[PDB]
Amino acid sequence: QDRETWGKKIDFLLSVIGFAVDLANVWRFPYLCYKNGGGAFLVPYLLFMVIAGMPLFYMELALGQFNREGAAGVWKICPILKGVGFTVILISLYVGFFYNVIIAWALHYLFSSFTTELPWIHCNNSWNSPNCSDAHPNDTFGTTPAAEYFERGVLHLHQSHGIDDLGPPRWQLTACLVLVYVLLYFSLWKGVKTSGKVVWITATMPYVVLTALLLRGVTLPGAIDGIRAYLSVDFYRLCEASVWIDAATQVCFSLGVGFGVLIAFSSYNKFTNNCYRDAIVTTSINSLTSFSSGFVVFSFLGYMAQKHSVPIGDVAKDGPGLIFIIYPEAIATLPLSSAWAVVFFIMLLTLGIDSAMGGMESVITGLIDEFQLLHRHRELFTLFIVLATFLLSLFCVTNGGIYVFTLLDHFAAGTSILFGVLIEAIGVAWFYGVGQFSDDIQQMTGQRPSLYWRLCWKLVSPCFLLFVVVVSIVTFRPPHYGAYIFPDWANALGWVIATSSMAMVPIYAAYKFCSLPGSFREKLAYAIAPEKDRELVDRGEVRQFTLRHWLKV
Ligand SMILES: CC(C)CCC[C@@H](C)[C@H]1CC[C@H]2[C@@H]3CC=C4C[C@@H](OC(=O)CCC(=O)O)CC[C@]4(C)[C@H]3CC[C@]12C
Ligand SMILES: CC(C)CCC[C@@H](C)[C@H]1CC[C@H]2[C@@H]3CC=C4C[C@@H](OC(=O)CCC(=O)O)CC[C@]4(C)[C@H]3CC[C@]12C
Ligand SMILES: CC(C)CCC[C@@H](C)[C@H]1CC[C@H]2[C@@H]3CC=C4C[C@@H](OC(=O)CCC(=O)O)CC[C@]4(C)[C@H]3CC[C@]12C
Ligand SMILES: CC(C)CCC[C@@H](C)[C@H]1CC[C@H]2[C@@H]3CC=C4C[C@@H](OC(=O)CCC(=O)O)CC[C@]4(C)[C@H]3CC[C@]12C
Ligand SMILES: CNc1nc(C#Cc2ccc(Cl)s2)nc2c1ncn2[C@H]1[C@H](O)[C@H](O)[C@]2(C(=O)OC)C[C@H]12
Ligand SMILES: COC(=O)[C@H]1[C@@H](c2ccc(F)cc2)C[C@@H]2CC[C@H]1N2C
Ligand SMILES: CCCCCCCCCCCCCCC
Ligand SMILES: *[C@@H]1O[C@H](CO)[C@@H](O)[C@H](O)[C@H]1NC(C)=O
Ligand SMILES: CCCCCCCCCCCC
Ligand SMILES: CCCCCCCCCCCC
Ligand SMILES: CCCCCCCCCCCC
Ligand SMILES: CCCCCCCCCCCC
Ligand SMILES: CCCCCCCCCCCC
Ligand SMILES: CCCCCCCCCCCC
Ligand SMILES: CCCCCCCCCC
Ligand SMILES: CCCCCCCCCC
Ligand SMILES: CCCCCCCCCC
Ligand SMILES: CCCCCCCCCC
Ligand SMILES: CCCCCCCCCC
Ligand SMILES: CCCCCCCCCC
Ligand SMILES: CCCCCCCCCC
Ligand SMILES: CCCCCCCCCC
Ligand SMILES: CCCCCCCC
Ligand SMILES: CCCCCCCC
Ligand SMILES: CCCCCCC
Ligand SMILES: CCCCCCC
Ligand SMILES: CCCCCCC
Ligand SMILES: CCCCCCC
Ligand SMILES: CCCCCCC
Ligand SMILES: CCCCCCC
Ligand SMILES: CCCCCCC
Ligand SMILES: CCCCCCC
Ligand SMILES: CCCCC
Ligand SMILES: CCCCC
Ligand SMILES: CCCCC
Ligand SMILES: CCCCC
Ligand SMILES: CCCCC
Ligand SMILES: CCCCC
Ligand SMILES: CCCCC
Ligand code: NA
Ligand SMILES: [Zn+2]
């Protein structure tokens, strides 16, 4: 049987929008806007989005749609550079070991909200230390009843001495995790017919909840101060070299490229689809969602800062668990706080689940495409992948699970994402040929891309990605959680996994070069030439050997 397609185009659009829209998308852009700049942070962000943010999205969508294969089989245009598909598959697999525990924490918090007394209001109970002090006129948000609850009565962090004292897993978090994985499996087992229909609810509820919170948040005292702090113009901030680095890193990391998800999602699209309009619409929606969500979150942050009589700089911080500490404290003061907590955690759960589903779907699709023996049994392979991910994600459930979560979050994606994106971009734009790519896009859609797209694909994007990779590998900082310093072997293991996700390109390159028969010239010709050019290569007319193809744009 031939490849199946999306039931409706709205399914594909909602799938990509839901995967791209993330919990980090809600916070990262507004936090960066407040930290350096404000209204002046939109200049570097928009500049980099135009220069090298849209071309990568468009190229990934077009490649996936035209080649009609997953992340690994899409590389018939350059067989030697096939290890990129395995690299992105490994990257997607690694991220699945802690996103699910994030969703499990959110789901556990959701269950403990159907009560008239939410268990983070006061601090007269069993799981609170005698150092509780919630003062309402030096860590002002440390030892808060909400923070103490999250750290002791949920995570049980105080019973671990570090990453060497994990201890047995907790059964409540394990039950939440198994519920999450059951949801994931039953949402991913029947191909894309049912995975594109479940997205209809998990990609439209967060917007409703965000609208409700914006309606509630604005009326709070001190919210206008938070919004003013969020959006304040300061053009002198553009003279520092850190604002541009932050903008470039955020543009690279918020797109969703590098996981091989957009290739698999667009692989099921019809051959006559219009990927240009789809890329434009998805990028615009994902960019505006961050703006609206920032309005909401900074209104709430301003209200909390006014309540605690502290500057907004102390409230606005980046860390794991602060989402479960500040806002739940803010929610409890409002009347009918149970409903607000319920909707808050429902929105969190949906935001997590859509992205986790997309990330697992990328791996499943790529591995199914690569090997034909698994194509006849998709449900069993999905069950095996889910079981493996669930077994390898049981470490974040233990008492010292926050340390493992921090290490994995620091090292899993890192520079590996940028290296994979750079390698795939340079491969597509140089080895295959930007002219051939434009011809394929014209055949697929009908209108050939203009000179701007070709220039951005060929010249600007590889240079921007290389600069991002270098600046990310130069300013590396070891991970930490509060006043905890990770052991040296933990950093070594993090670097080992980060390199292992990246060290598949040379391995496959060497294996493919040694496997092909002939001399050096024959091996190179069969390796670096497209599959469809086999007849020309046999005659001895390889286009890559000529330098005119290399210097063509
Ligand atoms: C309840 C209120 C307060 C919030 C509602 C939020 C969502 C229901 C909306 C917000 C933005 C909408 C999107 C905005 C733009 C488009 C483009 C629109 O046009 C197409 O791309 C046409 C595709 C086709 O031909 O089917 C398709 C729906 C979509 C994704 C919308 C789907 C529904 C979304 C997610
Ligand atoms: C990317 C994939 C492969 C997941 C990687 C997860 C790591 C962060 C895990 C996998 C192996 C784990 C180690 C396996 C064995 C142990 C012994 C263990 O010994 C104890 O003190 C607890 C013993 C017990 O459970 O009773 C302490 C944690 C540690 C170092 C673990 C720390 C966390 C590690 C490195
Ligand atoms: C909200 C999400 C994350 C989890 C819950 C989703 C389930 C309620 C849905 C998703 C997939 C659905 C299934 C998808 C396909 C089928 C096969 C279908 O059987 C047929 O008639 C076609 C196949 C056959 O001939 O067996 C019957 C409904 C069923 C079991 C569906 C029942 C409802 C399911 C389990
Ligand atoms: C930060 C918030 C407030 C808005 C963010 C939205 C942007 C990420 C989107 C919205 C409209 C998009 C643009 C819509 C149309 C085009 C035209 C397109 O260029 C052409 O078609 C050729 C024009 C030429 O010849 O220069 C290149 C992409 C671009 C700039 C898009 C880039 C991405 C943009 C700026
Ligand atoms: C104030 N502090 C934080 N607030 C928030 C928020 C929020 C709201 C959304 C809608 C509202 Cl309404 S409020 N998000 C944070 C914070 N600090 C880290 N994050 C992210 C980071 O991306 C990090 O990667 C992360 C994580 O590790 O979560 C377990 C995913 C969180
Ligand atoms: C840690 O990586 C992420 O959270 C990325 C992405 C994602 C990829 C894989 C995954 F399993 C779950 C989520 C979801 C979105 C798009 C890219 C980025 N997130 C901002
Ligand atoms: C924690 C993992 C949960 C996986 C989902 C449990 C149900 C598995 C059902 C398998 C059906 C296979 C299709 C028929 C062979
Ligand atoms: C709070 O008091 C406890 C006493 O059990 C002590 O162990 C802890 O270090 C104190 N924390 C701070 C921040 O003072
Ligand atoms: C039995 C205690 C119920 C507490 C209130 C819960 C309200 C949930 C419904 C609103 C969100 C849909
Ligand atoms: C959490 C509930 C799990 C129930 C599992 C039922 C599996 C049904 C498979 C039907 C195959 C035709
Ligand atoms: C919480 C998810 C529960 C999913 C139950 C699916 C049951 C499938 C029955 C199939 C009968 C033909
Ligand atoms: C989609 C439904 C939105 C309803 C939002 C209501 C929020 C409470 C308003 C309180 C005004 C004082
Ligand atoms: C809150 C997000 C709203 C985003 C609205 C974007 C609408 C784009 C429509 C494009 C039609 C061609
Ligand atoms: C669709 C439901 C969104 C959340 C509604 C919460 C209940 C608000 C009732 C009015 C409060 C004054
Ligand atoms: C002390 C009880 C520990 C239970 C762990 C959860 C079961 C794991 C099954 C693989
Ligand atoms: C210790 C009493 C409760 C046991 C629960 C067993 C199931 C946990 C999730 C698999
Ligand atoms: C046929 C169009 C369906 C649009 C997505 C579902 C909207 C649900 C609104 C709550
Ligand atoms: C893109 C140019 C941005 C210039 C910002 C203002 C610089 C002021 C220098 C005194
Ligand atoms: C009083 C300030 C109100 C701000 C509203 C912002 C709306 C952003 C688009 C949904
Ligand atoms: C939870 C384990 C379920 C395993 C699937 C059912 C047996 C399939 C044998 C081919
Ligand atoms: C012969 C039928 C089962 C073949 C194996 C299916 C995938 C199992 C996990 C690799
Ligand atoms: C991919 C090659 C670079 C590996 C990381 C940088 C060297 C170690 C720095 C501590
Ligand atoms: C007092 C003005 C409230 C405005 C709420 C947001 C309207 C879109
Ligand atoms: C710290 C930035 C170094 C940039 C080197 C050149 C990259 C193109
Ligand atoms: C991004 C546009 C900022 C303009 C500020 C004018 C006061
Ligand atoms: C000492 C307890 C061991 C539990 C193992 C669970 C996988
Ligand atoms: C208090 C949380 C209990 C979770 C039970 C999941 C079945
Ligand atoms: C064709 C039936 C689709 C149901 C979608 C429910 C959200
Ligand atoms: C590609 C990495 C080059 C070396 C970076 C550290 C100097
Ligand atoms: C203290 C040494 C621990 C080694 C762990 C290797 C995974
Ligand atoms: C000629 C092929 C070179 C591939 C190198 C990959 C890093
Ligand atoms: C994968 C690195 C070694 C390859 C050897 C091929 C003979
Ligand atoms: C739209 C950016 C902020 C203007 C004050
Ligand atoms: C994760 C890829 C391993 C080789 C198929
Ligand atoms: C007062 C305008 C704020 C941005 C819409
Ligand atoms: C992770 C192994 C996939 C099948 C070779
Ligand atoms: C998943 C591997 C199947 C046998 C080559
Ligand atoms: C606790 C999980 C052990 C097998 C991966
Ligand atoms: C068949 C190739 C698997 C990865 C080296
Ligand atoms: Na998401
Ligand atoms: Zn307080």
Numbering used by the authors: 58 to 194, 205 to 620
The authors write:
To facilitate expression and purification, we removed 56 residues from the N terminus that are predicted to be unstructured, and used the point mutant I248Y, which provided modest thermostability, together yielding the Δ-hDAT construct. Δ-hDAT exhibits dopamine transport and [3H]WIN35428 binding activities similar to the full-length, wild-type transporter. Collection of a large single-particle cryo-EM dataset and extensive image processing, which included ab initio-based 3D classification followed by non-uniform refinement, ultimately yielded a cryo-EM reconstruction of Δ-hDAT at 3.19 Å. β-CFT occupies the central site of Δ-hDAT, consistent with its action as a competitive inhibitor of dopamine uptake. The Na+ ion is coordinated with the main chain oxygens of V78 and L418 on TM1 and TM8, respectively, and side chains of D421 and S422 on TM8, with a mean coordination distance of 2.3 Å. The allosteric inhibitor, MRS7292, binds above the central site and underneath EL4, immediately adjacent to TM1b, via an induced-fit mechanism, occupying a binding pocket that is not present in the closely related hSERT protein.
Dopamine and the dopaminergic circuits in the brain are intimately involved in mood, reward, motivation and movement. Widely used therapeutic or illicit drugs, such as methylphenidate, amphetamines or cocaine, target the human dopamine transporter (hDAT), perturbing or inhibiting dopamine transport and thus disrupting dopaminergic signalling. The hDAT uses Na+ and Cl− gradients to enable substrate uptake, with K+ promoting the return of the transporter to the extracellular-facing conformation, following unbinding of substrate and ions within the cytoplasm.
